[PDB]
Design a protein around this ligand. Structure first.
Ligand SMILES: NC(=O)c1ccc[n+]([C@@H]2O[C@H](COP(=O)([O-])OP(=O)(O)OC[C@H]3O[C@@H](n4cnc5c(N)ncnc54)[C@H](OP(=O)(O)O)[C@@H]3O)[C@@H](O)[C@H]2O)c1
Ligand SMILES: NC(=O)c1ccc[n+]([C@@H]2O[C@H](COP(=O)([O-])OP(=O)(O)OC[C@H]3O[C@@H](n4cnc5c(N)ncnc54)[C@H](OP(=O)(O)O)[C@@H]3O)[C@@H](O)[C@H]2O)c1
Ligand SMILES: NC(=O)c1ccc[n+]([C@@H]2O[C@H](COP(=O)([O-])OP(=O)(O)OC[C@H]3O[C@@H](n4cnc5c(N)ncnc54)[C@H](OP(=O)(O)O)[C@@H]3O)[C@@H](O)[C@H]2O)c1
Ligand SMILES: NC(=O)c1ccc[n+]([C@@H]2O[C@H](COP(=O)([O-])OP(=O)(O)OC[C@H]3O[C@@H](n4cnc5c(N)ncnc54)[C@H](OP(=O)(O)O)[C@@H]3O)[C@@H](O)[C@H]2O)c1
Ligand SMILES: C[C@@H](O)[C@@H](O)c1cnc2nc(N)[nH]c(=O)c2n1
Lengths: 240, 240, 240, 240
């Protein structure tokens, strides 16, 4: 059994990754995963959980807000007490507050950092500890092309994504000594609830969640000897 | 049908990519590729061609030394006259001359640059022109982690690989305006004839060519709307 | 008068930058600055102020904590109300909490981010608004080599410095449209109170604050047509 | 006495660097530079030589085309025989051939690479050997923002500049072990003969060669303990 924890599994990219893992197992006999799915909305988890079980995958739903250190503790405790082992952590949960530099607020800043940087760091800190002892494990970070490129209305978002890359790079130093794989997925525009509105013509200039999920699962299925360290995906026409 | 040209298909990564495309078409009914395989050794081409045909793929071998502008012309003409269309170019052909800074010769320099930079540039120039007119196409560049990181015995190799990245980045500017996808594959140590001899470590500390071929083919199979711009792969233990 | 605000002016690099600007005003008469010096320690500001005055420069000290939004507002209004404009902002104030991944605390995280990212962002937001209106101005960000490279005990520090680079890059987008210069200073090890300890040996393998201050002042003195966008400095023997 | 060799000293940036070094000696009584000036045009060398001697600097002119290996040999021989020591090498000589991807020729390629990569590599190889033995020395590489960013009509130029960066990064690995400093100067548009034409408005959005020379000389004058590894400069309005 492969124990996988996917955060932000209720919508968009996280949801797509969960389904792709479920489908991959349905066609990859030797691969039997337990999909531990988490997000802030129980209702979303119930729906994706059902969809994954429909594919024949085992699931475990846990409602948690990683911006709340208490929930980070609960997530960790859940893995430790119920499985005592973790094979894959997909740090997908993330938020974005966009706007002109002058319009961004302290609330926009705190909201963005509490999830993108704080929750992501402490969940990683706690679960990497298990992988370190196992001398095995794979951590995926869904950052963004915004982790290496700036955009006008993304001052705070870019600080948070460049920041996540900083954590990713530090984790590589720890991981190479413990047989742990670190993958940094950097996508450009993906049509998901994160965008809200989105006109018809705009949707045609975006990638779809499943486009990101495929490479993520393939990376996990690579033999342990190899790590897809980075995967950058964008709409063929470039950034919006 | 899809017209694909893979340079350096005789061995190593190029051979692995050719074979993976063949296997893909075998389990992905709707993808019928014509694998145009090129190398400097006709003998290698015949062997890999047979293997691909065993998977049920159509092949077309042609001997060509991309360091020879005459052969670059012959290769381009072949695609234009025999197919008059190209869907995928895999710029895999490449050489490596390594050694301490003080020991590298003018010959090491010319040999490396004539293939990695000159041949690669002119073949790309000619075939991209076709894709630009088609408003469709995918070009893969097998560069290296040495395209963004230096290694003591790779002064000339790094000059050529950083150089290839310069070409890749310029091609993105052109490609995004004509529906063409550009993929930069950057692998670390891969056990291939390029290394020569190995032992306990080396091999055990390296990736295998098929590990690189898998994501290359998956990137090509992505819907036209999405481009996997970069894929960085390394042995889980890091550079050695 | 050239109105300069230097945060973290009481110690290390900030202190050296303040002194170097004062010395430049003595050697380059055409340059008349008002050095607004700020930090969290009053006595520090009094001493550096006296030293800068000894060089014949004008100074204005203000004790403030940039992690306190009220003080950020106080610093900004002081500039507007007393001088009406700002010509240079040196975002030097910064903190560092280091340790093995497993030893870092929530307090280490909050303390680092509140100053390095939050205070820096909001002070930049406020003062850039002024420069944008003036269509003139220069903002220096003292980030670090840790903004592009990771170090084992710098997981949180790197998240914060990579994060600052994210802000820097976004600011360039805004700055180019209103004649404002953005400079990102990235130093390696510099002997300052931030390191505490000592050892004549390791101290000999570090740069000195004045080595960083020189290029900063030279960059400000460049004609308005030119911006030194980035300056990377390291001990000749590399990172320690 | 400091022995400094500056290639491409007859025009633009190289010429400005030579003059700035000569002028800097005025504020440093213990700095007596011997400026070895080289380029392909003897007439230009005589001119800059006179201007430098007028500033009180010792000069030595040598006509050499670094794209001709024979000249690289004679240039190297000159340094070894006349001085037997070299304190600074400024690899400034460089050429540019621009145009749409489809219009670039094999000659554009060879001309660019023979100077930017080949001549630069072998001159660096030969002189670094002297510095390694001395356990002292400083090498400046004038690359470009085009060494990290692509431009539409710069496919070949970018291959050569990204390529130069590859050499720079490899040199850092060797330099850190023998007390040698490596500086990578990356400028954006600079009004020099390289551009030829002008239009006042155009020239108004460019930097001037003296703007580049200033930081170069100051980097050399830093104490030996510190190396300014990179300096990126651009017009305040950005790339044209
Ligand atoms: N969409 C793009 O264009 C794009 C591009 C590049 C990178 N990314 C990144 O990809 C990741 C997913 O983006 P998306 O487009 O899929 O966003 P989305 O459609 O809004 O879905 C986000 C998911 O993350 C969960 N989540 C957010 N904050 C959380 C928290 N504090 N605790 C627990 N769960 C949390 C959300 O839960 P709730 O809905 O229940 O609150 C939801 O399940 C993010 O890191 C995003 O930055 C997205
Ligand atoms: N192997 C690694 O660890 C590694 C890591 C990073 C990047 N790469 C890159 O991956 C690519 C393939 O490497 P590899 O390890 O597979 O090398 P390899 O095992 O030596 O195979 C190289 C292939 O390229 C062909 N080739 C070379 N120069 C050519 C030319 N001028 N014209 C036509 N064909 C030419 C060779 O043909 P002949 O044998 O008939 O001459 C052969 O078919 C290269 O760009 C290499 O730099 C390799
Ligand atoms: N030192 C290095 O090796 C090195 C290398 C690369 C980058 N850097 C960066 O360079 C900058 C300065 O470092 P340093 O070594 O000079 O540090 P330092 O010697 O400890 O001095 C830091 C200065 O910043 C002030 N400061 C810190 N947080 C502040 C806040 N929230 N509000 C107001 N003032 C604050 C401190 O004031 P108080 O002392 O009164 O509290 C002090 O005046 C930092 O951004 C640091 O990250 C340092
Ligand atoms: N100008 C810009 O906007 C800009 C921006 C970024 C980087 N750069 C780089 O800065 C460096 C200087 O550029 P520049 O604008 O000063 O060029 P420039 O005004 O055209 O002057 C070039 C100098 O280099 C010499 N040179 C060129 N090729 C040579 C060779 N093969 N052998 C010996 N000497 C040679 C030229 O000598 P002859 O005239 O006698 O042939 C001349 O002295 C180059 O590496 C260039 O790529 C320039
Ligand atoms: C790279 C960046 O475009 C990408 O991370 C991203 C994700 N979600 C987004 N969501 C909105 N609403 N706006 C954006 O610009 C945006 N952008």
């Amino acid at each position: 059994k492969h124990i996988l924890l996917i955060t932000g599994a209720g919508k968009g990219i996280g949801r797509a990754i969960a389904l792709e893992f479920a489908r991959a197992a349905r066609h990859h006999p030797d691969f039997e995963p337990v999909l531990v799915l988490s997000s802030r909305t129980a209702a979303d988890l119930e729906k994706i959980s059902l969809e994954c079980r429909a594919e024949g995958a085992l699931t475990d739903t846990i409602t948690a807000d990683i911006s709340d250190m208490a929930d980070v503790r609960r997530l960790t405790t859940h893995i430790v007490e119920r499985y005592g082992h973790i094979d894959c952590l997909v740090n997908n949960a993330g938020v974005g507050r966009f706007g002109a530099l002058s319009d961004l607020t302290e609330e926009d800043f705190d909201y963005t950092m509490n999830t993108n940087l704080k929750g992501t760091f402490f969940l990683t800190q706690a679960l990497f500890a298990l992988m370190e002892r196992q001398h095995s494990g794979h951590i995926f970070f869904i950052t963004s092309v915004a982790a290496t490129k700036a955009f006008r209305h993304s001052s705070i978002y870019c600080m948070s994504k460049f920041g996540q890359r900083g954590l990713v790079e530090t984790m590589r130093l720890y991981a190479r000594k413990c047989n742990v794989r670190i993958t940094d997925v950097q996508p450009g525009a993906v049509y998901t609830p994160m965008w809200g509105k989105v006109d018809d013509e705009m949707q045609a200039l975006m990638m779809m969640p499943e486009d990101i999920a495929a490479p993520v699962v393939q990376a996990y299925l690579q033999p342990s000897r190899t790590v897809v360290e980075e995967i950058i995906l964008r709409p063929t026409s470039g950034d919006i």
